[model samples]
Target: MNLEGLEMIAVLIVIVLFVKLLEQFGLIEDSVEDELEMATVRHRPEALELLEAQSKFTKKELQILYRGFKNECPSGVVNEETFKEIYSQFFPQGDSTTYAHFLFNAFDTDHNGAVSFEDFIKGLSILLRGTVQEKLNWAFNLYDINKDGYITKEEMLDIMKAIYDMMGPRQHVETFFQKMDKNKDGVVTIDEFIESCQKDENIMRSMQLFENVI
Candidate 1:
């Protein structure tokens, strides 16, 4: 092709590639902004299935979601989407699936593509129930192995391993500790433990699960 013709072809290619890049990055901001502006700002999609339960859970369920003793987010009033965002933060996409996915899939036992109250309860009974907290507390006692009432990484890993073993093969105790110790400081601070499990979905799942279980 002639030099001018080649230059014109190159410009067209550049323009096409740029458009594709923008689309891939969701850089079509004007459209997304428009949608956001007009967006109803709905919180959660409507119930896929009518959730039948014995009782609704109180904010205490958030505590159950975490690992340590008696830790809680004094602030209530978090909404659904924020909860999902929190979960995604701790359990980022990875080659090996995190506990979060297993929790979701476990509740979605039938894999009908979504969780029903029955599935929710079954998951809770298996993963939480009365066992997890007691197990965690017992583990915590060991970590404060020095009787300081605090758990070190070496201390916590021992507990993590014990719990993982008890929970069966899917439970990756080591992976969970690594995720919780966000700073790689090799210790799980009280703050870290609370933050790790306090995701909106985890809290909601606990509530839904308990309601069905009890």
Candidate 2:
């Protein structure tokens, strides 16, 4: 109505148009606010779900994780020295084995194999190693997509895709499904999920790429 009000409206419209233009040009890498029409996730589309599932490990799971991680070494032996070198390459001051097991225990709050949303949230909170509120904020950032309180499978898949592009392979993507569908039932179960994370590895390859994003 007023000239000042008219100017504000023009600015808002410009901002919205800019956002749409960025998406068209593929410049926005922050998050996916748009809806994905697909019905399901195809394979290890991104790899977080598989990784998240494995993060909640029991004593057995820890053994599986450790052995699998060690196999990443040239001699299949991972000591503090080797771990140090590896961490320096990827995450300086951030220990992989320590964080890997920390994630495991975080999700295994009940010392159980399965990880519920509650345990997932708690573990992620500590991941920031920040305040409780900040941890909760990051958890919501990943799980709360629709600006909705719940985490949907679609949102999960999109996050997986981004992670996959960064870490998963294009050729062997189907290889993951072939190995993970252990029951021959065509669907991956929790047991199969863990096994999928531990897929066969040679010492020449590193765990950073293959350990969880299967």
Mark the regions of model 2 whose C-alpha exceeds 4 Å error after superposition. 1-121, 124-160, 164-171, 202-214
On a 0 to 100 scale, what is the lDDT of residue 69 in model 1? Answer: 16
Candidate 1 wrong stretches, greater than 4 Å: 1-149, 163-171, 211-214
The best candidate by lDDT is 1
RMSD of each: 22.1, 21.5
Error of 2 at 4 (Å): 31
lDDT of 2 by residue, 99-168 (tens): 3222222234344443333443344223323332333333333323333334344444443353333222
Q: Which residue pairs clash in candidate 1? A: 83-200
> What's each prediction's TM-score?
0.29, 0.24
